[PDB]
Amino acid sequence: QCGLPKLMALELFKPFVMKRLVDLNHAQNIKSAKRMVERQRPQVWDVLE
Amino acid sequence: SFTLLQDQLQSVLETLSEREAGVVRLRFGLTDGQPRTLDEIGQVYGVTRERIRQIESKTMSKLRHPSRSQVLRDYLD
DNA sequence: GCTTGACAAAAGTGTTAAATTGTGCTATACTGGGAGCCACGGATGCG
DNA sequence: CGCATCCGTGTAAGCACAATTTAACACTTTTGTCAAGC
């Protein structure tokens, strides 16, 4: 195991997070998911988990 | 995302309107690539210039409806 | 629901002016640049 | 045939005329628009 910072991990996994957000209807499309992630809304962290 | 537009804006809204959007495919050249004037898309069939002029406004009003309008909001900056 | 005719605006044809670019000419005499502030390996003459 | 030394190498155009390209203007065709009626 290794500990990875939230800010770093989010930027590395951005595309996976966007896909998962789109699937769970937190964002309407890819641009919406990317904009949501760039603002780092509270719902992004649960998806990243 | 542009390709996803070819999946949404180009396709689904056309399936639910038949020729009301089939003419639009010729209007902006979604097929064969040529945007076409009212006469060109009308002269080959039995529909006049003014009728296509009315149909374009009717389609614009139809697609302004919130149910269709809300979906495409994210594809425009 | 669809068509007819007058009307305003936008898109073509063609002429013309202008700006932009290319080529040629100038006959006192002048005639040969001027810069400039190393060590290593492979080969050939000599002993 | 081996060694010492030499070499190669990583300060000064401007004008005239002709030809091409680009814009400005004018009119004409086409397009979209409006009302009204068939």
Curated annotation (Swiss-Prot), chain A:
* Signal peptide range: none
* Lineage top rank: taxon: Bacteria
What this protein is reported to do is described as: DNA-dependent RNA polymerase catalyzes the transcription of DNA into RNA using the four ribonucleoside triphosphates as substrates.
Assembly information from the UniProt record: The RNAP catalytic core consists of 2 alpha, 1 beta, 1 beta' and 1 omega subunit. When a sigma factor is associated with the core the holoenzyme is formed, which can initiate transcription.
Q: Which family does it belong to?
A: Belongs to the RNA polymerase beta' chain family.
What is the name attached to this protein's record? DNA-directed RNA polymerase subunit beta'
**Species:** Mycolicibacterium smegmatis (strain ATCC 700084 / mc(2)155)
The portion of the full protein included here is 440 to 488 of 1317
